[PDB]
Amino acid sequence: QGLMQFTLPVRLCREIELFHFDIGPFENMWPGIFVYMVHRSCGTSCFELEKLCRFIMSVKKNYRRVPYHNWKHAVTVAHCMYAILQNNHTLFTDLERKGLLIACLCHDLDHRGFSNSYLQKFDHPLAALYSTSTMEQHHFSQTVSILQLEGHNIFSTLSSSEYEQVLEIIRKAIIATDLALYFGNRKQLEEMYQTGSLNLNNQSHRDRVIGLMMTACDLCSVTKLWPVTKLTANDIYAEFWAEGDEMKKLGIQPIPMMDRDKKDEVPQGQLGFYNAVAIPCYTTLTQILPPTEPLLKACRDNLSQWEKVIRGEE
Ligand SMILES: Cc1nn(-c2ccc(Cl)cc2)c2sc(C(=O)NC[C@H]3CCCO3)cc12
Ligand SMILES: [Mg+2]
Numbered sequence: 467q468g469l470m471q472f473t474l475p476v477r478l479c480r481e482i483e484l485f486h487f488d489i490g491p492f493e494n495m496w497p498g499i500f501v502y503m504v505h506r507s508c509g510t511s512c513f514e515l516e517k518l519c520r521f522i523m524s525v526k527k528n529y530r531r532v533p534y535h536n537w538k539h540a541v542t543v544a545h546c547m548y549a550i551l552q553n554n555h556t557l558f559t560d561l562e563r564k565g566l567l568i569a570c571l572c573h574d575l576d577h578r579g580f581s582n583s584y585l586q587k588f589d590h591p592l593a594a595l596y597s598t599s600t601m602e603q604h605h606f607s608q609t610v611s612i613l614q615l616e617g618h619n620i621f622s623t624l625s626s627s628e629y630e631q632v633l634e635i636i637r638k639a640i641i642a643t644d645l646a647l648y649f650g651n652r653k654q655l656e657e658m659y660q661t662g663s664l665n666l667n668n669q670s671h672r673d674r675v676i677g678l679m680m681t682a683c684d685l686c687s688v689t690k691l692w693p694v695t696k697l698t699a700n701d702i703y704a705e706f707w708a709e710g711d712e713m714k715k716l717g718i719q720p721i722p723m724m725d726r727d728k729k730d731e732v733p734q735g736q737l738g739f740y741n742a743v744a745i746p747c748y749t750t751l752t753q754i755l756p757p758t759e760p761l762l763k764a765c766r767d768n769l770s771q772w773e774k775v776i777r778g779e780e
């Protein structure tokens with residue numbers, strides 16, 4: 467180091483601070499963007515540059531060449547977290563800031579572009595190993611593995627205590643990314659919020675809130691500018707439809723969302739998702755963390771665009 471501040475071009479330097487920032491098509495800039503974010507979010511001091519770079523590069527290696535659940539997604543998810551963190555400065559511990567960005571970069575490690583359901587149906591070994599939140603348990607495993615590679619311990623300066631804590635933040639963060647788990651998490655959060663029992667001092671409560679953050683960051687493509695949103699959806703469905711094909715191969719009619727023959731149903735399917743998942747998520751998040759409100763606003767914006775698609779206004 468250490469007088470070695472990462473910098474971005476002006477337009478990026480500015481726009482990176484906003485929720486709706488798109489990380490762009492230049493793959494080779496993404497590590498730098500992450501490092502920037504970490505340094506800004508955490509400090510230049512939180513990690514050994516050399517170690518961090520090495521870690522980042524290995525993580526990258528371990529993301530596959532799938533249409534959606536790839537390295538770009540990783541970095542995209544991290545950036546939304548960075549925005550949250552940066553707009554809610556004083557709310558988060560030092561350990562949290564460290565762990566959370568890392569969690570996000572690692573949260574879909576070695577993803578195959580297939581759902582937990584498919585894995586179960588196919589009878590994949592991972593399904594036997596991990597009976598719930600299959601892929602998520604895997605992602606965490608892979609994170610630990612990489613952390614354990616020579617010269618990849620970015621956590622090396624932390625005490626034994628602090629280290630166990632950070633890894634525990636990360637584990638919970640990653641597990642939260644299991645959407646099946648989101649619904650109940652949010653319901654509880656909403657109830658607490660409303661009955662005024664929510665208490666950020668209660669770890670158990672903090673956990674929940676971090677969970678929701680996770681989901682939020684994870685779905686952040688719904689919070690982009692429309693053409694980004696629109697184009698990312700293509701990627702999302704490319705995976706769904708491939709899975710659909712695989713379901714059919716196992717002799718199972720897939721859900722229509724995964725049936726490429728039922729493309730026509732996409733817009734309506736987006737509507738449901740926005741309504742059932744996305745909108746509530748950002749709403750409760752805004753309740754708990756008011757400065758995250760732009761995420762809710764952008765989501766609503768995108769809902770409306772899907773309404774327009776349906777009305778053939780595009
Ligand atoms: C519709 C739909 N749109 N998206 C979506 C949109 C935007 C982002 Cl940014 C991320 C996701 C999802 S994720 C999901 C889901 O996971 N369903 C679970 C189902 C499948 C397999 C069996 O159970 C269903 C949808
Ligand atoms: Mg995932």
Ligand SMILES: [Zn+2]
Pocket residue numbers: 539543573574643684
């Ligand atoms: Zn993800």
